[PDB]
Amino acid sequence: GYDRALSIFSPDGHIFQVEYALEAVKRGTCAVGVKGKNCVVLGCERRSTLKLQDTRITPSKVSKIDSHVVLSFSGLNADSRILIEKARVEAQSHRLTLEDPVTVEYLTRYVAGVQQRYTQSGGVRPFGVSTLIAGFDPRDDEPKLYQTEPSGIYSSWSAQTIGRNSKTVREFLEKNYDRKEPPATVEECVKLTVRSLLEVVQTGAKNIEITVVKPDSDIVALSSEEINQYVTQIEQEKQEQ
Amino acid sequence: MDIILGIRVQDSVILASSKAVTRGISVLKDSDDKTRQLSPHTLMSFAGEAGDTVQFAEYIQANIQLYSIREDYELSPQAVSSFVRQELAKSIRSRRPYQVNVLIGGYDKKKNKPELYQIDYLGTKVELPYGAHGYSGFYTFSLLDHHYRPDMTTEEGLDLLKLCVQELEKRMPMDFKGVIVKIVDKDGIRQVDDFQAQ
Amino acid sequence: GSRRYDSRTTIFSPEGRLYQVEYALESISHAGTAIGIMASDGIVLAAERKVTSTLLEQDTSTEKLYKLNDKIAVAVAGLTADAEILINTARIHAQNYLKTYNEDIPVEILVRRLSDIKQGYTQHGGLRPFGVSFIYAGYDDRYGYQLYTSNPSGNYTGWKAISVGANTSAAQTLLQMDYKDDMKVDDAIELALKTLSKTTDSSALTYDRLEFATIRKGANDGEVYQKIFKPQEIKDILVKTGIT
Amino acid sequence: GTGYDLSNSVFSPDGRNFQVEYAVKAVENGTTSIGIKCNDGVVFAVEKLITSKLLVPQKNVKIQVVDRHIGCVYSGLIPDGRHLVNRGREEAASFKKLYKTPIPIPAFADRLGQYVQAHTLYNSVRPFGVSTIFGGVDKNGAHLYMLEPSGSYWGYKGAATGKGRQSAKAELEKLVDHHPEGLSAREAVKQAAKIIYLAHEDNKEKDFELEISWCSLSETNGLHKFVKGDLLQEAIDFAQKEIN
Amino acid sequence: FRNNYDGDTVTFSPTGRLFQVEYALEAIKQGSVTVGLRSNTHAVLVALKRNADELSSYQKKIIKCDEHMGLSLAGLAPDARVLSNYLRQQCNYSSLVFNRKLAVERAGHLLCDKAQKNTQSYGGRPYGVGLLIIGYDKSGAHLLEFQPSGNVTELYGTAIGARSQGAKTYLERTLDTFIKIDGNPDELIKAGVEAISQSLRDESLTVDNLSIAIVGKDTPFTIYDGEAVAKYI
Amino acid sequence: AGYDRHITIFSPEGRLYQVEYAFKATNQTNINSLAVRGKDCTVVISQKKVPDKLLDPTTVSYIFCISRTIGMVVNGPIPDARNAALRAKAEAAEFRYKYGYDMPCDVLAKRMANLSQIYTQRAYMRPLGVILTFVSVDEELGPSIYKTDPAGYYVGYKATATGPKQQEITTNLENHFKKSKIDHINEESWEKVVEFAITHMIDALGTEFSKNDLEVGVATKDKFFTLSAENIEERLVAIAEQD
Amino acid sequence: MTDRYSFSLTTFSPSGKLGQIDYALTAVKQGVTSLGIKATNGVVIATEKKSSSPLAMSETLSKVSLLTPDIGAVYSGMGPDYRVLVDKSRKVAHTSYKRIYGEYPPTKLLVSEVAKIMQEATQSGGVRPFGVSLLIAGHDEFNGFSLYQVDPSGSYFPWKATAIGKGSVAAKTFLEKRWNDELELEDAIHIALLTLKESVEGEFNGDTIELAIIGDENPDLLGYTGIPTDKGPRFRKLTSQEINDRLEAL
Amino acid sequence: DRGVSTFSPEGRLFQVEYSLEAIKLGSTAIGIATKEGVVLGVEKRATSPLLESDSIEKIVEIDRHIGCAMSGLTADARSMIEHARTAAVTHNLYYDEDINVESLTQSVCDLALRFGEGASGEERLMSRPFGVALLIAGHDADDGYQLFHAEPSGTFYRYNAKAIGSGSEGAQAELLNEWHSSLTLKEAELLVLKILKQVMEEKLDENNAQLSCITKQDGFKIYDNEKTAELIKELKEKEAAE
Amino acid sequence: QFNPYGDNGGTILGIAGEDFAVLAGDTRNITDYSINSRYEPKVFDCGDNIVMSANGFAADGDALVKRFKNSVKWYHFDHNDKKLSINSAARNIQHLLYGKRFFPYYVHTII
Ligand SMILES: [Mg+2]
Ligand SMILES: [Mg+2]
Ligand SMILES: [Mg+2]
Ligand SMILES: [Mg+2]
């Protein structure tokens, strides 16, 4: 019944609702993604306003879409669930009608499509979410990483971050990421990821989470102690000169 | 009709499924796999009306795959068949029902017990030691009544199946071109590829 | 025509906030406090009935503690009438699930579904958000005892202990201060009441001003149990915890 | 604090609906048109402002027939009155289909009445920018009506509306005094041409074209017909002769 | 006043005016000129086509509705597409159902009624285009002028668009000459290019610039552009 | 913004201005009307005012026939009155069809009042600016007066009056019913109760009437009808040979 | 046409207030006093029949309504809003309950249904909230006697006794003084009458007062006999006379 | 706050004029039409060195004989292409022939003014105009090589050359001077690469600009990096030459 | 019971020459054993140099002829007065026909 046109042009040619959507992302907790030679690694920060949290059950930021693709995000947590759910459904539908799981670019093009539509359909407001989509196309070993924003726009990245203080972590990555030779290890790619968050987190003993995707649906997340070992070896190394 | 058989031993569930695809006067294929893996530890076989048979199986498959990804969790076999039964029970009062009888064999990880569920196209579910759909039953049930022990091994269970398949190859008017057998146990789903000469 | 009178409930602020959700959250801050604390052997829900008379029927009353199925219950803060609308649909989703799967709905699935309904009103339809916050207390055989919060935004999170409504700042620091992980349930009962004693705006904290419930498990049974406390029992538990 | 005149269905503090009052303005601004009820029929005349030599004479017809027996003439926003007659034709056919008998003029009047009134009920529509003079001969007499943008309509002995509305009513009132006897079909045609000529005094700077129609039990069989040729020229001349 | 009463077409001003409609009429004035004129045997449409750059097409202003009827547009071109498309359907409907060629007088009534619907309902907008409709039906030559307000008038000749006031005065003077051009197409078009010339501060009307269409007695509606209009410049 | 004055929502003091203004519109005709109950009938009187000499006086009425038994008089503008009259006739017809017995006066009133209450609450509908007085001789309740307003309010009256001079007439009758101590007019023939009403309308308003200044509707067992000028002329003649 | 108002007309103001609910409650505040008191063997609802003219017949307008043969309602606020709330309450008692279980709903559940109906006027597109507060009095086999208040917010609470409308603050004080858990029904009627005299300006008798009880079954209002397990309605609205008897020995 | 399809007193639609503003902020796109093919060139404009500059698709295939370039809010173009590709493929199905470019363009532009409610029209579901202009280039047997400029205004123009985006007013004045009816394909490929180099902020390498053409023989082709790389190499030489 | 289909007889012939084409048909319309008309042409000119016959049930025949003729008209309107080539027309008709796949036009048709 309700179809009022919420996302509209203003005289400077701007669509204020989509720009305000981006502002919501800007205040979302920071997410980063970097790709290696044989892996993509996704990092997120955790908030510490209140931390009497049950981390067993609380929704984590890195979500599986199919068994070979993941999705992290920055912005409104509620809105993210409406994309993750839709994208998971579209993944199964693709496997059903095509007899092959989604390519990472396809799954991305799809999410972006959804985000865009919410910016020119009556009665609905844009998603206050930006995403990083990572994984491996079926039967491929060449890693993929994509970014979408509320406007419906998307593209791939060697590495990228979104959310609060993402200028700082992107800055770090534009300096410290060499495309001539990307991180060759799982380990040396995870290290490059922790390093970039440490420019924003301030002690990520339990305020940093990391997920490692590999070819052929090989996805595992690290626990505190495993990540703690990285934080340790990074600041001890940085100490001396 | 097609042959769909299932037997729940002690460590696992064994599913035998005829290989033939007959349309009218010709056998169009003798290597047909009348099965779908629904999750790592749950397997479904199916026989029935032409198109419906696969279209339903694949549909159920996608729906459990979706559930697994949404919950990062594999449903219990008991829950999968309950879902399947509802789908069929819904289907019967629709404009055009799915005419598909299925067997659902799974290994439950909580209870550490194998389970075999038989559901016909009407939505009639029951849990059994052994089951069959269509005419298969009329031959095999009596033979299984005799030779079945609840504490049989996967090896003994396969011996007992070999005896059912022989009885059917003897008395069934139709050449169902042998079977494809699959085992469901705690370590997942595997196929006994050598049932032609074993 | 109509455009003149539209509050546009589902729009972003220049700061990327949702006015209506924030003012709804502001609304909730005035509502009586609810607390949930999860121990190893059970969960506690405690809540403050905001405004009472001596003529208010204490027994046949429910305004903060509601049952959803046999294993899940909720503490409410905010608009009671809105909460019941959401509570009923929740009770139904739990039953659809049982019908489909022949198993009791896992707490998270219930919480997500309910929160997804909330997020809806945030993003389309141009209706006002539900002015309600929920503490969910549940048990399922996947994650054992679980505690969850949701608010008008559509966001849910999991907790070891939490509070919603008035004075959550005061309450949240007090809980963070005295909570240990290997708490037994009778410790958690005691802590919940203390925190409420310390945040109230009333003279003191009498039994008529409280709603109290526990999800336990009679140790010689092997199955879960929900106990909503009758007005008399809350007066008993107030004495032992040392606030007569 | 005001703003009472922006939406269509809003009552002002003194009880008025300003949009309908503004609608009337567009009517008064329009070309002048009249109706005369005689002793067995009805006459309808309208002024037609010739802006230019380019307008084709005889061609831009303003009077509309509804069914076979009803004539309509309207002053104001021409496309509105066209739309109103469209609804009037639908209403007349629907009535005939069910009841066989062609629609009575009182019956018909209310059909327009109800529909026009219904456009002063909601802000999502605007009122009609026309006043309509209509009538015909039914199973018991001739009937003449006029309908305001408000939805108001009454039976008239004579009716007038538009730019020349005030001088016309004066001429009309005269006739009602001289002949309380009647006034024939053939006479009122000439008398309408006069009253249009006298009312053209207001739109004097532009040249005009007269258009007459009638529905008479004796002269047209109780069917609506345009006044043409010899009888038209004879009434134009009667008007010219009596303008001096 | 003005300011407060122009947010949509559902609102009257205290004067009694529909401002959204009058702003629609302003799109016409802002649009490129076009001229229409008929004798007793033919009816002509002449149009000055407008380009963006000097590297762009001259956007076409004349549309065919049926074999016996067509129109010229001045204003919002997509709206003239919406309305001609509707008019095509009505012409087409008449041939198919009644085996009858739609009367030109009636096409007017149809357009008016369609335009009017947009001027009374919320969330709508008036049509932002003026139209000149020519046709030869069962009662001879016809020319119609259509306004976004719903006002359709039958004239011998007229013009709409930018500077159209010059052409309109010319025709008012030439009336008695052109009304009698019965049986010569070529001479009636000559008098239509001459008429459109009273509306030019711009420049010479060239081959890519001019657009002429004709219908009548023994001629189905056809459009001329290019060397087709060479002999007329 | 002071928009709480344009649609039917609550003002901070808890009032609905649009409802309040709709009452203003009822008086805009400047027609006074009253209703009284006989021994076995009910009569309504209304001022008939024909300002324009060009009007056909026979078409100028604010008294409506709803059914064979129900009559309705309206204080308020004519277009909203006819809007209300039509609904009422439709509602009354349908009652009979569905339920197999004539729609009772009070029930029609309750329904019409329920429709009004809706325009009070649903924002897109404006109230109808009219006050509706229903009359009949009910087969179950006896002779009946029932009145509704833009508020959604409705009640039954012993007698009632409405219009700009509602109050003069109301007090006039208030007095009569105390001296007479009964809550109706003790008279068998309706012609005498029609007179009684015309009389107390003169005495309250302080004006004289000709047959063309009044409008009269009468309800009896099984019929509701309106008097012509000649039927009133008989009534005006009768009053004048005694008072 | 069409309800083009498909958006809420009740929204949250920066302070967290729901404007339209607040203003609805204000309209209730101006409403004529009504009250309800619960005894050990019955409940009583009472209100003042404020007559808008001495020419009106106050019987033709009941402020106290039967909802089910075991449940009665009374209100303070806007009459018309109450009237259509009574029709909807009656209907939902059949559609949502009687036509399902062959018995009438218990008091709480029906109350809850009305509460739902009000809640929706607080959220649905294009409506204002209901301008009334309801007092609902009922009996049912398994819960016994009960009294409930329903606010324009859709919020409901159970009471031992309370009043709403005008002098409610005075009355709630008056009622706290006089209530105990040992009251017989006749005693609560007596208290109800006294509490209502405080708020009543003009005449105070069985013509200007409306009073109803939820007592035991009246096997004599049933209308039939022969079915021994139908004793009839527990709701009885007292007569003009019955009220005066308790006043002549007040 | 007025309606969306309100008219300004000047006699133009508010939302359609503001969308045109959104377009000026967009990447530069240039189309040049010869009698040997049509050339499409765009500015990639990666917002960071970390962005993989070839995941930027501002030139898309519609059919084997129609491709387009976009400029503005480029997510808005996704559904315009989906409809265009469909229109073409559909037309082929019904008629066993290639859709006319002028017809494909007309079809795309019909979509553009559908931003209403269904009230007083038909059904017009979509809240705001598109924030993107299109350059539609192709070939058909009736009119040979064609270049069309598609707007959110519903109107579309045919051009010998056209530029849209941030450099649009400067780049156009340049095309005005260079363009003549006898231009070869290679001459147009260079001209596109020249004018992009000028209006772009960045130094034009084969990474922040993309080239494509549609000829009747080989259809619509995107130029891969190596081939574009060697055409820049050749422009530098020919510009240093004089 | 109402049978929506009838048979009007007739016979049509179409021969494609090396640079020409002919499509012929008899002028006889018939029901059962009665004659209806001795001159009722069923081979039609549709412009763009395409001739067509839809023989069989005469009501469905005229309906199809009429619908395709209108396809021609609307092709010009939609595609800048392009000629509808014979192969295009054929495909167009396949779609007109299959459109009624579950209530067929009871006609063998030749262009
Ligand atoms: Mg008048
Ligand atoms: Mg209202
Ligand atoms: Mg309204
Ligand atoms: Mg072709």
Swiss-Prot record, chain B:
Pfam family, one: Proteasome
Family matches, as InterPro entries: Ntn_hydrolases_N (IPR029055), Proteasome_beta2 (IPR035206), Proteasome_bsu_CS (IPR016050), Proteasome_sua/b (IPR001353), Proteasome_suB-type (IPR023333)
Modified-residue entries (Phosphoserine), positions: 76
Keywords: Acetylation, Cytoplasm, Nucleus, Phosphoprotein, Proteasome
Modified residues (N-acetylmethionine): 1
Source organism superkingdom: Eukaryota
GO biological process, any: proteasome-mediated ubiquitin-dependent protein catabolic process
Record Gene3D superfamilies: Glutamine Phosphoribosylpyrophosphate, subunit 1, domain 1 (3.60.20.10)
Miscellaneous field: Present with 21800 molecules/cell in log phase SD medium.
The protein's name in its UniProt record: Proteasome subunit beta type-4
UniProt gene name: PRE1
From Swiss-Prot, chain E:
Annotated InterPro entries: Ntn_hydrolases_N, Proteasome_alpha, Proteasome_alpha-type, Proteasome_asu_N, Proteasome_sua/b
SMART domains, per database record: Proteasome_A_N (SM00948)
Record PTM Phosphoserine, positions in chain: 13
Keyword Nucleus set for record: yes
Top-level taxon in the UniProt lineage: Eukaryota
PROSITE patterns in the record: PROTEASOME_ALPHA_1, PROTEASOME_ALPHA_2
One GO CC term on file: proteasome storage granule
Keywords: Cytoplasm, Isopeptide bond, Nucleus, Phosphoprotein, Proteasome, Ubl conjugation
Pfam families to which the protein is assigned, alphabetical: Proteasome, Proteasome_A_N
Biological process terms in GO annotation: proteasomal ubiquitin-independent protein catabolic process; proteasome-mediated ubiquitin-dependent protein catabolic process
Protein purpose: The proteasome degrades poly-ubiquitinated proteins in the cytoplasm and in the nucleus. It is essential for the regulated turnover of proteins and for the removal of misfolded proteins. The proteasome is a multicatalytic proteinase complex that is characterized by its ability to cleave peptides with Arg, Phe, Tyr, Leu, and Glu adjacent to the leaving group at neutral or slightly basic pH. It has an ATP-dependent proteolytic activity.
Family: Belongs to the peptidase T1A family.
Misc: Present with 7210 molecules/cell in log phase SD medium.
Protein's UniProt name: Proteasome subunit alpha type-6
Swiss-Prot record, chain F:
Record-listed Phosphoserine modification sites: 228
Family: Belongs to the peptidase T1A family.
GO cellular component: mitochondrion; nucleus; proteasome complex; proteasome core complex, alpha-subunit complex
UniProt protein name: Proteasome subunit alpha type-1
The keyword Ubl conjugation belongs to this UniProt entry's keyword annotation: yes
BP terms from Gene Ontology: proteasomal ubiquitin-independent protein catabolic process; proteasome-mediated ubiquitin-dependent protein catabolic process
Compartments (UniProt record): Cytoplasm; Nucleus
Subunit structure: The 26S proteasome consists of a 20S proteasome core and two 19S regulatory subunits. The 20S proteasome core is composed of 28 subunits that are arranged in four stacked rings, resulting in a barrel-shaped structure. The two end rings are each formed by seven alpha subunits, and the two central rings are each formed by seven beta subunits. The catalytic chamber with the active sites is on the inside of the barrel. Interacts with CIC1.
The keyword Magnesium belongs to this UniProt entry's keyword annotation: no
Pfam family, one: Proteasome
Function comment: The proteasome degrades poly-ubiquitinated proteins in the cytoplasm and in the nucleus. It is essential for the regulated turnover of proteins and for the removal of misfolded proteins. The proteasome is a multicatalytic proteinase complex that is characterized by its ability to cleave peptides with Arg, Phe, Tyr, Leu, and Glu adjacent to the leaving group at neutral or slightly basic pH. It has an ATP-dependent proteolytic activity.
Gene behind the chain: SCL1
Chain residue numbers at which the record places covalent cross-link Glycyl lysine isopeptide (Lys-Gly) (interchain with G-Cter in ubiquitin): 223
From Swiss-Prot, chain H:
Disulfide bridge partners, by residue number: none
Keywords: Cytoplasm, Nucleus, Phosphoprotein, Proteasome
Residue list for modification Phosphothreonine: 47
GO CC entries: nucleus; proteasome complex; proteasome core complex, alpha-subunit complex; proteasome storage granule
Signal peptide: none
Gene3D superfamilies cross-referenced by the UniProt entry: Glutamine Phosphoribosylpyrophosphate, subunit 1, domain 1
Location of Phosphoserine modifications: 48
Keyword Cytoplasm attached: yes
Subcellular location: Cytoplasm; Nucleus
Pfam families linked to this entry: Proteasome, Proteasome_A_N
CDD domains given in the database record: proteasome_alpha_type_5
InterPro entries with a match to the protein in the record: Ntn_hydrolases_N, Proteasome_alpha, Proteasome_alpha-type, Proteasome_alpha_type_5, Proteasome_asu_N, Proteasome_sua/b
Keyword Nucleus assigned: yes
Miscellaneous note of the record: Present with 17100 molecules/cell in log phase SD medium.
Family matches, as NCBIfam families: PRK03996.1
Binding partners and assembly: The 26S proteasome consists of a 20S proteasome core and two 19S regulatory subunits. The 20S proteasome core is composed of 28 subunits that are arranged in four stacked rings, resulting in a barrel-shaped structure. The two end rings are each formed by seven alpha subunits, and the two central rings are each formed by seven beta subunits. The catalytic chamber with the active sites is on the inside of the barrel.
Family, similarity comment: Belongs to the peptidase T1A family.
Protein name per its UniProtKB record: Proteasome subunit alpha type-5
